[PDB]
UniProtKB/Swiss-Prot annotation, chain A:
The lineage of its organism: Bacteria, Pseudomonadati, Chlamydiota, Chlamydiia, Chlamydiales. It comes from the Bacteria. This is Ribonucleoside-diphosphate reductase subunit beta. The gene is nrdB. Binds 2 iron ions per subunit. Provides the precursors necessary for DNA synthesis. Catalyzes the biosynthesis of deoxyribonucleotides from the corresponding ribonucleotides. Its cofactor is Fe cation. Belongs to the ribonucleoside diphosphate reductase small chain family.
Length: 336, 331
């Protein structure tokens, strides 16, 4: 257990040694008593593990062949109703990933005063960029009008409704005056976290996944499908991290978790469910093979219940999952 | 290139929403509030997108690089006290330097680069900083170093602190929650931050260290650390090229900011960085090690400074030769 002479670096600023970080002084928010620039010693092992797991999931949209997708898209084989599902989903996702990425950088990162959690955030934000690249790649491959697709959240009411809601639940976290060192401020911050991790990534995205992966299972648009499988694998970790972060902040700041905040989070999730159901209905006015709006009523309620449970809230809908295969692809894409 | 099929268009039910489609010619690198920043398309800055694609093609993780030979050498008496000093001081500086760079991308740069393709690159770059930070943790754990001792070096070692303090100063007022780039003064301050982090920190302050560590690698010493630094160098080369492109792009779009006064201030900042970096090299090398002496870094740091100056349209000022020409070899 012995190293040779000179294996330590020597300080010439003696008072500087006090800036070594006390592990137990570290906190997820409002931590100004220790140096946030030093990674060590790691306190939140869960955050570090999410980071390592994400790093092991590198993929690039350009590694996935689109030849069969292009051939199918350009043919007359797809019904207009099938195309409608694909186009609306691309429309929503093309900008939703940028909304998530921008929120990580511009809202979340400043207030998560912890280096190991920030490491994960940097991986997460980069993954959003990869997802955005996916939608560009799909548009270019299929010869879609890229501006029509990317502007969809400004042109289609059911998509705009979801993203206007997102803006509302973002709160004032972007404001130069926003701070998390009041009870009210930290509560607002937690609502932003619920909005992005639980609602946008955990409910809005998972519903899109069923629509697209339903095509994949029918051997239609399998290039898009494979890309969405990779996206789902990432989003599984994003969600797990977000849940851990919310639960960690609650534990360290129990005064924020009032009946009032609890009830508001429940109402926000209810509003998300209604908006996602309305979106599914816009995607499926008549339904397509293997996909009807009524199935999404049950599915969206089901997953909302699962999200509520994970952050210590009671399930409210009690519906069953009409897509058992999603759980099996969820199983295959489970975090280590 | 096939025909657009019937029914393959997304139909609008908000009729005036079409106005929000982004006009290519309206996009700008800074102060762009006339178009929607959330939509990537249409891509204007091809150079930014190219840097993004290049970074994505460079994936690596430190845990993929075996440390067995490095551990054996570190435990042996075949590495001198002086060689250990060079390694430890560099690990000390780099362990927090990448966190500083990444934090600045997120907390200072991203908000004000009002362009989605440039932001795609920034997210890739910030993730690469995280990979580099991981690298230094992994080296510490592999070699059984005191991790708190290494990561706290920038608070404990004067020559390291001097570099990072200068870095805090040149960061300017960009972190002020009310800082804005929509004035000549504001944009000049922002450009000074870009020079500070891309040119000075990533383009000069990393370079004595690269030379020192890669010199060990060329002598077959600590080849595990060496390989990790080779991957870091590959990333850092793209970081620098992006930063130079961004600075030059902002200048082109806002030429009124590039005043003789600003040009002179930037030269003076780079001169101060050179002095600090030479002092850091002197701290690493109180005595010579094979092919490395403190005096060599006077020539080298000045040489690379001249190269950085040229790339952002400023005249070289030192005119020194490069004593480490092998740094320009491809691996």
């Amino acid at each position: 257990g012995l190293v040779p002479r000179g294996s330590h670096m020597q300080a010439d600023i003696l008072d500087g040694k006090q800036k070594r970080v006390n592990l137990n002084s570290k906190r997820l928010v409002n931590c100004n008593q220790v140096d946030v620039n030093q990674l060590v010693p790691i306190k939140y092992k869960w955050a570090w593990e999410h980071y390592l797991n994400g790093c092991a999931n590198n993929w690039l949209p350009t590694e996935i062949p689109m030849g069969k997708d292009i051939e199918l898209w350009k043919s007359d084989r797809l019904s207009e109703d099938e195309r409608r599902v694909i186009l609306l989903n691309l429309g929503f996702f093309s900008t939703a990933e940028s909304l998530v990425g921008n929120n990580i950088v511009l809202a979340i990162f400043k207030h998560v005063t912890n280096p190991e959690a920030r490491q994960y955030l940097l991986r997460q934000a980069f993954e959003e960029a990869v997802h955005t690249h996916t939608f560009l790649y799909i548009c270019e491959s299929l010869g879609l009008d890229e501006k029509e697709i990317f502007n969809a959240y400004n042109e289609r009411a059911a998509i705009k409704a979801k993203d206007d809601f997102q803006m509302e639940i973002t709160g004032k976290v972007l404001d130069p005056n926003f701070r998390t060192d009041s009870v009210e401020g930290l509560q607002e911050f937690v609502k932003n976290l619920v909005g992005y991790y639980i609602i946008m990534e955990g409910i809005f995205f998972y519903s899109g996944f069923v629509m697209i992966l339903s095509f994949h299972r029918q051997n239609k648009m399998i290039g898009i499908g494979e890309q969405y499988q990779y996206i789902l694998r990432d989003e599984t970790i994003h969600l797990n991290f977000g849940i851990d972060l919310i639960n960690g902040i609650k534990e360290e700041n129990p005064e924020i978790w009032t009946p009032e905040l609890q009830q508001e989070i429940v109402e926000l999730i209810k509003r998300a469910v209604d908006l996602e159901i309305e979106y599914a209905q816009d995607c499926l006015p008549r339904g397509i093979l293997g996909l009807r709006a009524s199935m999404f009523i049950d599915y969206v309620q089901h997953i909302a219940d699962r999200r509520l449970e994970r952050i210590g809230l009671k399930p409210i809908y009690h519906t069953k999952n009409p897509f058992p295969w999603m759980s099996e692809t969820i199983d295959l894409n489970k975090e280590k």
